[PDB]
Each structure stands twice: as C-alpha cells, then as structure tokens.
Amino acid sequence: DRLTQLQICLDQMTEQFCATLNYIDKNHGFERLTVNEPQMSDKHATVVPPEEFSNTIDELSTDIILKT
Amino acid sequence: PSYYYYVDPETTYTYQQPNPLQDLISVYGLDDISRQVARTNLDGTKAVKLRKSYKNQIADLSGKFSTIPTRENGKGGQIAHILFQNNNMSEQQWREQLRNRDIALFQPPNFDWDLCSSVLSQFERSYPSE
Amino acid sequence: PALPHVEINQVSLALVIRNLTVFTMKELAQYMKTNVHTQANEPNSAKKIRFLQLIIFLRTQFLKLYVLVKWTRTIKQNNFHVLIDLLNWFRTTNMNVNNCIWALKSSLNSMTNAKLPN
Amino acid sequence: MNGNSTNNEQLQQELATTQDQVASIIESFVELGVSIYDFPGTPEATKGMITNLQRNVDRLYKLNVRSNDPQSSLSKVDIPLEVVQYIEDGRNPDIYTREFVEAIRRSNQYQRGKMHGLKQLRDSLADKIVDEFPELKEPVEDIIKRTSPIDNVSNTH
C-alpha cells in the first residue's frame, strides 16, 4: 500500500510541475523595460496583481517541496 | 562525491537566437518604423493620432471625391483577387521579350481605336440625370 | 540573426501594378466590345451612364493604387518582411512554452499505462 | 549596406515617379469625367476625350514597362494581401503598420513577462531546495550558473 501512495505522490509531482508551468505561462503579465515605453492591456489576457502573483508562485513552490 | 543524473558540468546552454529579453525592435533595426507610427513621442510629448481613413493621404490631389470609397458604400470592388493573379537571348533581350509580351494586350486588335472613336461618338446631347 | 523568411500571401508591387493595368484595359476592352451595337435595351444615354460608372470605378482603383504606393513610401528601408519574419518567430516561440507543457502532459498520458498496482 | 542603401534610394525615386504618374492618371480621369458630365456634344469634345484616353493609355504603357524592366525594385517590394484589402475597406493603411508593430511589441512584452516569470519560478525553487536540502546546494548552484550563462545577446537592448 505504501508503494501505491508513492506512485500517487509521483504523479502528484508531475501534476504540480505542469500546473506551475501552466500558471506561469498563463497568468504572467507585461513588464516595462523602461518607463517611457507604452504599457497596454488586453481584455483577453488574465492580468493579475504582481504581488499576489509572486505569493501564488511562492505557495506553488512550497507545496511542491512539502510534497517532496 | 556522488554524480547526479543528467546534471553534467560540461553540458552548457545558451540564450535563444534572437533573445526575446532585449527589445527585438532595435535588434533588427526597426526603430525607424516604431517612432514614425508611435501614438506618443519619446520625449514626454503626445504624438498625433493617425486618422481613421486615408483622407490625409489623398489630400494632395484635386478631384471630385469628398467621401471615401469602401466595401460597404458600394464604391469599391473585390480587386485584390485580380491583383493577386499570376501567370541565346541575353537578360536585356529576355527582359525586352517579357516587357513586350506585357504590351501585346495593350495595343490593337485588342484595343481598336477607330471602334472606340465611333462608339464614344455615339453619346448624344447633354447628361441625363439619375 | 537568422529569421525564417515567409513567402506565404505576399506579392511584389510590380505584379500588382501589372495586374491592375491589364485589368483596367481589359475592362476597357470589355466595355468596348459590348457597347458597339445600340438597341432599345441599351440606349446611348445609358451607354454614357455606364461609361461614367466605369471611369469612376477605374479612378477609384487607381486611387487605391496611389494609397498603396504612398504606404510603401512610408517604409524607408523596405524591411517589412523582417517584421513579418519576427512575428512568425514570435508565433513559434509563444507555442514553445506551451509545447514543452504538452510534451510533459503527453509523457504523463503515455505513462498512465505503465504501473504495477498492489 | 551600400548596395542596400542605393537600392532603397532608387526604390524611393521609383516610388515617387510611380506616384506622380498615378496622380497624372487620376487628374486625367477627373478631367474626362467632368468632360463627360459637361459634354457640349461637339466633335471637338469627342476628340478631346479621345485624347484624354490616349494620354491615360500611354501613361499605362509607361508604368507597365516600368513594372517589367530589369532595373526595377518594384519586384523587390513585399506586399501582403492584408494591406491591399485593408485599403479597400477605406480605412487608413498606416494603422496597419501601427497595429502591426504594436502586435510585435505586445508579443515581445508577453514573452518578456513569461521570461521573467520563469526566472522567478526558477530561483524561488532553487532557494527553497537549498533551504530544504543542504546536500544538494552545489548541484543547484551549478545548474543556476549553467542555466544563467553570461549575456552576449542580452547586453544590447
């Protein structure tokens, strides 16, 4: 039964990896190289506040290593 | 020391070519295209907004036009389909052959001029108004 | 740097100038041959109206050509294909981060058939 | 670059002469159009509009032969269908350049944001791993220096 929980933990690693990649691919924003360049927004783009963006990055990372 | 799988010190990786980190407008010399259409000038001053129509392009020609011929006003046509149609001797001679075979449609018997003189002479007096 | 040049859905300006010229005098010829004979169905006043409509249409087409040549005059270095190749490179690269994700997901879906349960 | 520069200069001269020939054709068209609308019915006006057609046809000769001569950069001009069908809508073609370069910049900034987000995920993961696993700190730092190489195509902006 222990190996079964191990396999569940292994594909939970893989699901966490693809979920973190999906989150960082979809919910990232648009970064200013300089201040004079135009910052435009898209209604079809899921924009998030950057501080809670980093907080979600942190909690995704910490759940990865607590599962580890 | 224990070696770890697929962590090899001699294995190295480089940046993407071209690198999307840098402003790829400047890498390919496209900055001239950038600020010529920019909505704001890069000195804090707002630049002029481009017009909705091309009236400013055609503003330098004197004609009878006051509106803009579009698809939806019944003034233009599906001309792009026609415009996207496609078909010893030196390069001078061969280019002469190409340019002259592009002249054979431009002369009689394709465009008989006596026929056009007689036909447009058929227009009677005055302009009927519709 | 190297960019894969795309040859899809472009055309030379000489080709569209040639196409417009052959089209305009082909339409001139086609209006020419149909209006040789005058009947009650086609009075010469209606012939003049049709000629006015055709010359207005040709003026419209050459105005479009004028706008096109002005637009080509706006670009100085004639490097619009560089911009198109850069965008097609962007289209390839944006999918690559999705492509590795889908590679991992396909790896998992092929992995599901390979366990050994309790 | 010298060949490209003189090609662009000769191309600009060709564009200017095509534009003035097209302007002459359009002026001749409005002249013969108002001649048709203000027709006096005379044979002289018939010959005049014949003459207008004659100058239009020989202008078409001159700008067709310049569309096929060997010394032509008009073949080197790259034109998509979207700009010509964009003009046929009656709506301004410099917007196509404006919106097109804005799409370039928008995609570049989307990619740069994804780039920085991947960097944040990477180094947060690295710091957290070396916090949990002290025995793995040397391979993690080796991976970091391997996967963050010295910038030779990033120092330029």
Say yes or no for a CB contact (<8 Å) between A11 and C104: no
- The answer, yes or no, to whether the previous bond of A49 is cis (omega within 30 of 0) is no
Which of D98, D99, D112 best tests the A interface by mutation, with the highest count of A CBs <10 A? D112
Q: Give the contacts of B110 (CB within 8 A, at least 6 positions apart).
A: B104, C25, C29
Contact residues, chain A to chain D, C-beta under 8 Å: 20, 24-25, 28-31, 33, 37-38, 40, 42, 45, 53-54, 57-58, 61-62, 64-65, 68
Residue B60 to residue C99: CA distance in whole angstroms: 51
Residue D14 to residue D8: CA distance in whole angstroms: 10
Say yes or no for a CB contact (<8 Å) between C108 and A3: no
**Which residue in D has a C-alpha nearest to residue B54's C-alpha?**
D92
Q: In the block, which residue shows the tokens 């001749």? A: D28
D157: which 2 tokens? 């902006």
For the CA atoms of B89, B92, B96, B97, the dihedral, rounded to the nearest 10 degrees, stands at: 20
**Which residue in C has a C-alpha nearest to residue B113's C-alpha?**
C32
Interface of D with A in 111-150 (CB under 8 A): 112-114, 116-118, 120-121, 124-125, 128-129, 132
What CA–CA distances, in Å, run from D151 to A34, C2, D148? 19, 19, 8
Closest in C36, C45, C60 to B69, CB measured = C60
- The answer, yes or no, to whether the previous bond of D134 is cis (omega within 30 of 0) is no
Interface of B with A in 87-106 (CB under 8 A): none
DSSP summary character for residue C10: E
CA dihedral over A28, A29, A30, A32, signed as positive or negative: negative
Q: What is B71-99 written as a DSSP string? A: TTTTS----HHHHT------HHHHHHHHH
Q: Which segments of C1-118 are extended strands (E)?
A: 10-11
CB B18 within 8 A of CB B27: yes
Helix, strand, or coil (residue A18): helix
| Residue type (1 letter), C72 | T
Residue numbers in A near D118 (CB within 8 A): 24
In which element (H, E) is residue D80 found?
strand D79-80
Residue numbers in A near D129 (CB within 8 A): 65
* Structural determination approach: cryo-EM
Interface of A with C in 8-67 (CB under 8 A): 11, 14-15, 17-18, 21-22, 25
List, in sequence order, the alpha helices (H) in chain B: 24-27, 31-36, 80-83, 91-101, 113-120
Q: Does D82 touch chain B (CB under 8 A)?
A: no
**Which residue in D has a C-alpha nearest to residue B12's C-alpha?**
D146
Using alpha carbons only, give the angle A13, A15, A19 rounded to the nearest 5 degrees: 115
Interface of B with C in 19-38 (CB under 8 A): 20, 24, 27-30, 32-33, 36
Neighbours of C19 (CB within 10 A): 20
Closest in C101, C108, C115 to A21, CB measured = C101
Resolution in angstroms comes to: 3.6
DSSP summary character for residue B45: P
CB D49 within 8 A of CB D115: no
Neighbours of D86 (CB within 10 A): 21
CB C47 within 8 A of CB D100: no
| Residue type (1 letter), D85 | Q
**Which residue in C has a C-alpha nearest to residue D153's C-alpha?**
C1
Q: In the block, which residue shows the tokens 């079809």? A: A44
DSSP summary character for residue B48: P
| Residue type (1 letter), C39 | Q
Distance from the A36 Cα atom to the nearest Cα atom in chain B, whole angstroms: 7
Residue A14 to residue A24: CA distance in whole angstroms: 15
What CA–CA distances, in Å, run from C19 to B86, B99, D67, D90? 8, 13, 10, 21
Closest in C14, C18, C67 to D93, CB measured = C67
Distance from the B74 Cα atom to the nearest Cα atom in chain D, whole angstroms: 11
Residue numbers in C near B66 (CB within 8 A): none
In which element (H, E) is residue B37 found?
none
List, in sequence order, the alpha helices (H) in D66-92: 81-88
Q: Which of B123, B59, B85, B20 is nearest to D112 (CA)?
A: B20
In which element (H, E) is residue B43 found?
none
CA dihedral over A50, A52, A55, A59, signed as positive or negative: negative
**Interchain CB contacts (distance < 8 Å): A and C:** 24
Neighbours of B29 (CB within 10 A): 11
Residue numbers after which chain D breaks, C to N beyond 2.5 angstroms: none
Chains in contact with chain D (at least 3 beta-carbon pairs closer than 8 A): A, B, C
Neighbours of D84 (CB within 10 A): 21
**Which residue in D has a C-alpha nearest to residue B34's C-alpha?**
D101
CB D37 within 8 A of CB B123: no
What CA–CA distances, in Å, run from C114 to C100, D40, D135? 21, 93, 32
Q: Give the contacts of D48 (CB within 8 A, at least 6 positions apart).
A: D35
Say yes or no for a CB contact (<8 Å) between A25 and C115: no
Determine phi and psi for C12, rounding to 5 degrees.
-80, 155
Distance from the C116 Cα atom to the nearest Cα atom in chain B, whole angstroms: 24
**Which residue in B has a C-alpha nearest to residue A38's C-alpha?**
B40
